[PDB]
Ligand binder design. Sequence first.
Ligand SMILES: *Cc1c(COP(=O)(O)O)cnc(C)c1O
Ligand SMILES: *Cc1c(COP(=O)(O)O)cnc(C)c1O
Lengths: 279, 284
Amino acid sequence: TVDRINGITPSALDLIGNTPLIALDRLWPGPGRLLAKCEFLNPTASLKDRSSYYMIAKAKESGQLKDGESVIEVTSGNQGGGIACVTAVMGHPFTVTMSKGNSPQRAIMMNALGANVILVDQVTGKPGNVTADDVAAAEETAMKIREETNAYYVDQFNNPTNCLAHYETTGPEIWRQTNGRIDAFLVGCGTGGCFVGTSKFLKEKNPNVRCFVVEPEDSISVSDEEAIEYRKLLGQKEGLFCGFTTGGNIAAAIKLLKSGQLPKDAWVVTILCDSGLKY
Amino acid sequence: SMTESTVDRINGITPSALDLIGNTPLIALDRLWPGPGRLLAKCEFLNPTASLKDRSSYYMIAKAKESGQLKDGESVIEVTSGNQGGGIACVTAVMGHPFTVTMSKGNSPQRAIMMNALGANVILVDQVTGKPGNVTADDVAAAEETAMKIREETNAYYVDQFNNPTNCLAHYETTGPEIWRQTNGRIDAFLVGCGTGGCFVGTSKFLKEKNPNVRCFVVEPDSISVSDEEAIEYRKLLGQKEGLFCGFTTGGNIAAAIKLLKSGQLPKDAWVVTILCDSGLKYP
Ligand SMILES: *Cc1c(COP(=O)(O)O)cnc(C)c1O
Ligand SMILES: *Cc1c(COP(=O)(O)O)cnc(C)c1O
């Protein structure tokens, strides 16, 4: 019932989701149409605000996370900022572990949103190069803190409410905003929550909607070169500065539009995942 | 436009980044300020370049087009290292105007990243008196001289933000009216810092027409002063209590608004509105 346009937004939680669906009609002038969800307009400037809100809100509803108790996650990425935002508003202490090998830039927003950032010594890597063993040491620090404090472990890769977020919000919004006119959806996979949750909802509304995973070097392959080139083109043609994964989603969507696999007049929807300012 | 729009951002399709400019949320900072009275703030960090400058950027380009000073597909030039250069880059990108920007080599290269990502042609100009980190009056004057030379050859429209009347107009026609609508006419005080002064002058002029009793304050580094330490402290508290990462000028705005609420100068149940000017991500 919140009116963001003509009323008061009660908290940052009300800024999560209901993102614009922008038409990229200058980047792709036809035939057919390319549209993308503006997930860079979430309060921490990534789609992770949706999964962060769900994982914390559902842990609270189930009674697994009690009023004012501590939360822990291992991350260097957008999910840390998202959880920090939601825990800040809801009054949960938040601890985050990440390798000292990450750029200090990766901690700035999480720390500004009240996260207790624990930098964990690299085991095998050097600065700018966080290895599997570096991350395994940050996971081990987080499990030790969790055992010592009874903190709620968010467990982004194994938490089912991650994909529920996109099934209940992202999917329904796209369906509403297109008034059901959508031939294809595509996005890359980290947790896979956005792809799995959105696609499940869209396929329930229209089973003929074609859902594609964008796979970095059913699926569309994209190189770092394509991601970079289309990140730049999105900025030059649409005035939107997004991250590398957004560049790959645009490159993939344009390959799909030219493929002739869809009708000539196809409407294709993807995701603008985050702000280019997060890099 | 921003004022004649039938675009439904929530339940329909947003035609372009231009339609993302303005109509920003007015957020209640009820955890940072639990009462009595209320602190609210415009989320200008949710503009497409993550600053309030998208509003003045759109007005300056659209009015130059309307007047016939800037013709279809013609070039634009500005001297800037700031949020204004990102805003003008966004608007020129969508509207199909080649955009050139000169700035001193004394600026952090971070200041050019977004402008360049949005297709601005960034020309870096040799410092005349200053050192890296320290851009002087003469360093800036040399950037202006480079831009005037390029403008002589290209006939580019010069934005000239500090002398452009449409700068103020943007806030009189958009920011003020939005705040008045979003509060349903409940506002006892408005405050913001001054750069160009466009936001303060435009917003305050509108609010005073709607409610002559409204008190308008300039935030200075009448008026409310804040130390660097206060701006930093309240930037941190805005993040910790409200989950919003904004720039240093936003910290200054919140410190001033909290000082005003605590002063007892306004009624106990006063509603105070300020501006969350930009994202903390635009800094190091
Ligand atoms: C998380 C993330 C993704 C992938 O989203 P999942 O729902 O985790 O699969 C893509 N791009 C960016 C920038 C992300 O932060
Ligand atoms: C320009 C700017 C201001 C001041 O706004 P004016 O309308 O130019 O006075 C405040 N904060 C930020 C971040 C700005 O970029």
